[PDB]
Write a protein that binds this ligand. Structure first.
Ligand SMILES: CC(=O)c1c(C)[nH]c(-c2csc(N3CCNCC3)n2)c1CCC(C)C
Length: 112
């Protein structure tokens, strides 16, 4: 397919995913200065600002590479935070609500 419509769709999809993060807790990198142990078990931090940078740097050329980074946002938060926290439940909610956004976008991408 053609590059420009695909990037437009990824931009729209990323905005829809960010809208599901109502607390904006995934909008910028986890502040490593305030979480010194974050990287002890988190191999690759991810957040929506970094995703936007990657999108605009042409790093996402298929849907699965975009979805992989979204899945890291979720999985990193589930891994670091205890189950009884707001952050763990926020990642569950984002997995569910964002999963629906992504399925719809992939169906748009497949019609291109
Ligand atoms: C660990 C985690 O999954 C996180 C996610 C998804 N977002 C953020 C976040 C955004 S801003 C911020 N601040 C600024 C105010 N002081 C506290 C740290 N933390 C975290 C770290 C939370 C930890 C400190 C309990």
């Amino acid at each position: 397919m053609q590059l420009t419509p695909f990037l437009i769709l990824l931009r729209k999809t990323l905005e829809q995913l960010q809208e599901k993060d109502t607390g904006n807790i995934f909008s910028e990198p986890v502040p490593l200065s305030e979480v010194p142990d974050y990287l002890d078990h988190i191999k690759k931090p991810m957040d929506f600002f970094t995703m936007k940078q990657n999108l605009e740097a042409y790093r996402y050329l298929n849907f699965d590479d975009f979805e992989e980074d979204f899945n890291l946002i979720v999985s990193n938060c589930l891994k670091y935070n205890a189950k009884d926290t707001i952050f763990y439940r926020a990642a569950v909610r984002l997995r569910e609500q964002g999963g629906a956004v992504l399925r719809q976008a992939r169906r748009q991408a497949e019609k291109m």
